[PDB]
């Protein structure tokens, strides 16, 4: 608990939906 990083997510070619596994 120090900094506020950001993971990676996968986008989808459908109903505005994007997220990681």
Swiss-Prot record:
<keyword id="KW-0399">Innate immunity</keyword>
<keyword id="KW-0391">Immunity</keyword>
<dbReference type="GO" id="GO:0042742">
    <property type="term" value="P:defense response to bacterium"/>
</dbReference>
<protein>
    <recommendedName>
        <fullName>Thanatin</fullName>
    </recommendedName>
</protein>
<dbReference type="GO" id="GO:0045087">
    <property type="term" value="P:innate immune response"/>
</dbReference>
<keyword id="KW-0964">Secreted</keyword>
<dbReference type="GO" id="GO:0005576">
    <property type="term" value="C:extracellular region"/>
</dbReference>
<dbReference type="GO" id="GO:0050832">
    <property type="term" value="P:defense response to fungus"/>
</dbReference>
<keyword id="KW-1015">Disulfide bond</keyword>
<feature type="disulfide bond">
    <location>
        <begin position="11"/>
        <end position="18"/>
    </location>
</feature>
<keyword id="KW-0295">Fungicide</keyword>
<dbReference type="GO" id="GO:0031640">
    <property type="term" value="P:killing of cells of another organism"/>
</dbReference>
<comment type="function">
    <text>Insect defense peptide with a broad spectrum of activity against Gram-positive and Gram-negative bacteria and fungi. No activity against S.aureus. Stops respiration in bacteria but does not permeabilize their inner membranes.</text>
</comment>
<keyword id="KW-0929">Antimicrobial</keyword>
<keyword id="KW-0044">Antibiotic</keyword>
